[PDB]
Design a protein around this ligand. Structure first.
Ligand SMILES: *[C@@H]1O[C@H](CO)[C@@H](O[C@@H]2O[C@H](CO)[C@@H](O[C@@H]3O[C@H](CO)[C@@H](O)[C@H](O[C@H]4O[C@H](CO)[C@@H](O)[C@H](O)[C@@H]4O[C@H]4O[C@H](CO)[C@@H](O)[C@H](O)[C@@H]4O)[C@@H]3O)[C@H](O)[C@H]2NC(C)=O)[C@H](O)[C@H]1NC(C)=O
Ligand SMILES: *[C@@H]1O[C@H](CO)[C@@H](O[C@@H]2O[C@H](CO)[C@@H](O[C@@H]3O[C@H](CO[C@H]4O[C@H](CO)[C@@H](O)[C@H](O)[C@@H]4O)[C@@H](O)[C@H](O[C@H]4O[C@H](CO)[C@@H](O)[C@H](O)[C@@H]4O)[C@@H]3O)[C@H](O)[C@H]2NC(C)=O)[C@H](O)[C@H]1NC(C)=O
Lengths: 368, 364
């Protein structure tokens, strides 16, 4: 009916959504940290191969290891650039889109909760006009509904309330007298939900226009009908006009950069299909006057014994086993590269071996 | 004044604040971009010195350049780690804090704007009860008041509405019948602003309690008085209880990591006062007494003035990378090569040539 409260079938999905949205910022922190961690891990790999080369100038694996060092360098350096130029924006965009939409939901729900007055005024109701939802701490009846934003810390958010498709649990309809999301008359009423003057909010004159609230989701009529709830289940371009904050949280969520993305992970598949690897074969190893078709593939087979992805493994294993003795970079005890993961530490070790490598040349040249 | 509309003196500050908050996300994007940029600059310096060493093994500047190389590496690697562990959270925090607050403000302002109906219902008024503010695109009575969020793109926000101290332009007072933020009665009314049943919103019974709206800033009474506006000018711990979203945007804004912070910038001071530089003298250069690092630095650089590294850095910058290295088309000095991907390719190629040199010297 006109001007009864909103049923729990309509507001409980909003409580679920605000609960879900509350963790998006934190999930964006977590995802950013994992992106940076991945960049770091690839930098560490660059460093390990670099250190092995500096320590072992006479290696018989010079070309294989040069290639791999170059590969990891491109991947970490390009990854960090991609995070700056594209990735970080997606994560900030989604955190703020969720937070903006959540702020409007929380404000409107709070206002409806607050318009409770004796038997005659109740806006968040259960299944009839007379029974207000009961707040107990952060719950409204049995549904978590904390109209607050938590501390930003790493989180894993739920993915049921705002999916790839849209907002599947938000109800849609209303706008007549069917008692769909506002029950039949009894005693309690929520005049805010009608902009008509006989039984609704305004004095004497109806509202000049229908009102859009909940950032465009809900229409408050200026005629003697129920509020309308828009269809948010199948989101798309048209919501940019009718419900921009809802379209924006949806699209931003779908466009989040992930640590598992191509930009921030090692390439996969056969060696000649790893585009950074293949390009570096041509950059670092081929003569500039190479005349051959598929020269990169041929060189990779000559280097690694085939094109399967696991053909690099014995080389990376050799790097990992290499022991860095106590005394390099002030280190107290020996350790194999495979146990040293800290980028600052690895940077120090590389620095020390580049000096040692220069000293080696000077000594050689001195001996003649 | 019970149940008349809000004067422009009260709501225009809210418009100003939502306008300012609209750019906070984009400023945090810019800030994070500059942090990364600074980390990349230091990395580029790490690479240039490395490349110089790989190309010039007999340099008489070996110790100086090894130290600088090591310093840039600690700085850039430590910087990125600091951004992951501490900085990035500060920036996402502030973006989302501002956005959350803005979402509440925009929703409530929108509602007030929307409760306009004939001569008798007007909630955002000018200076009297009968004159509603006029919207013209993004402006309300000529004040910017776009109840929307822009695209997230790098930009700089204003700092007049949410300052280090608080919210200086938001009014405070109300709660009686002084006509302070709601004008004397005439024909227009805003019944939402009173929770008392004779002239205000609710039918028959007053609201059970006062209502807190605008995320705690505004109190709607359940007695025959004007709304109350909280004092938000000097923020502090008391606002945690009563206006937590306002406290959160304010503290988060204050705590933003900046690209100019110590974790993302070169050290300054006399050379012996630069703690990374000093530590590395011991890590990389010093065998095994008092002031040994300072003494070594002075000898290496010909003094301890901060600019005593400049000669070494200028020599690196001048080093030409000829066409043909790492597929490059043209020659350029290191000083004109800034792209970290390109620099990593250059180092890769020169370390291979360097190892080939050793193998040749040992053969001969
Ligand atoms: C931390 O500190 C490091 C070290 O200082 C920073 O790394 C250097 O960063 C700068 C970029 O900011 C980079 O490029 C130089 O930038 C200067 C302009 O901003 C230029 O002065 C310099 O160019 C000179 O040398 C070129 C190559 O020789 C010349 O072609 C050019 O014409 C300039 O030459 C003039 O200047 C020299 C010396 O003053 C003098 O002989 C004549 O006037 C000459 O005509 C570069 O483009 C450096 O390459 C970086 N240094 C290294 C060693 O990598 C890092 O950015 C800092 N980090 C942060 C966050 O600030
Ligand atoms: C891109 O790819 C590089 C190259 O693989 C990765 O760098 C390696 O990262 C690993 C894991 O941190 C480093 O540590 C060593 O891992 C080896 C196994 O690595 C593979 O399997 C793990 C688990 O699935 C993957 O996470 C990893 O990506 C690899 O696929 C272990 O075998 C090593 O231990 C062995 O060696 C030491 C010494 O010989 C012994 O003490 C052990 O008992 C054991 O025999 C070790 O744990 C490894 O050092 C890195 N390699 C190099 C060259 O740096 C990057 O992490 C990856 N980047 C991303 C984002 O995935």
């Amino acid at each position: 009916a006109e001007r009864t409260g909103l049923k729990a079938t309509a507001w409980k999905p909003l409580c679920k959504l605000t609960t879900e949205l509350s963790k998006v910022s934190g999930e964006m922190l977590n995802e950013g940290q994992e992106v940076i961690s991945n960049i770091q891990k690839i930098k560490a790999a660059e460093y390990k191969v670099s250190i092995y080369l500096a320590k072992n100038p006479e290696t018989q694996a010079l070309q294989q290891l040069t290639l791999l060092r170059g590969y990891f360098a491109r991947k970490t350096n390009g990854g960090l650039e991609s995070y700056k130029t594209m990735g970080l924006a997606t994560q900030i965009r989604s955190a703020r889109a969720a937070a903006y939409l959540k702020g409007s939901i929380d404000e409107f729900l709070n206002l409806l909760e607050s318009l409770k007055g004796g038997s005659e005024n109740k806006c968040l109701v259960t299944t009839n006009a007379d029974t207000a939802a009961t707040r107990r701490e952060t719950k409204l009846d049995d549904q978590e509904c904390a109209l607050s934003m938590p501390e930003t810390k790493p989180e894993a958010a739920t993915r049921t309330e705002l999916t790839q498709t849209g907002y599947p649990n938000l109800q849609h309809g209303g706008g007549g007298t069917a008692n769909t999301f506002q029950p039949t008359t009894s005693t309690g009423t929520c005049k805010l939900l009608s902009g008509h003057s006989t039984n609704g909010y305004p004095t004497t004159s109806a509202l000049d226009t229908t009102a859009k609230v909940l950032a465009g989701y809900m229409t408050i009529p200026n005629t003697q009908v129920e509020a309308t709830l828009a269809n948010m289940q199948a989101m798309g371009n048209g919501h940019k006009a009718t419900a921009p904050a809802w379209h924006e949280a949806w699209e931003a969520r779908n466009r989040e950069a992930k640590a598992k993305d191509l930009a921030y992970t090692n390439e996969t598949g056969n060696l000649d299909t790893q585009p950074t690897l293949k390009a570096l074969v041509k950059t670092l190893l081929l003569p500039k006057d190479n005349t051959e078709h598929n020269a990169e593939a041929t060189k990779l087979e000559a280097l690694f014994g085939g094109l399967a992805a696991d053909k690099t493994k014995t080389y990376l294993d050799m790097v990992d086993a290499e022991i860095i003795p106590a005394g390099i970079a002030g280190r107290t005890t020996e350790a194999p590269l495979g146990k040293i993961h800290d980028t600052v530490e690895l940077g120090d070790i590389l620095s020390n071996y580049e000096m040692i490598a220069a000293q080696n040349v000077v000594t050689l040249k001195k001996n003649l």
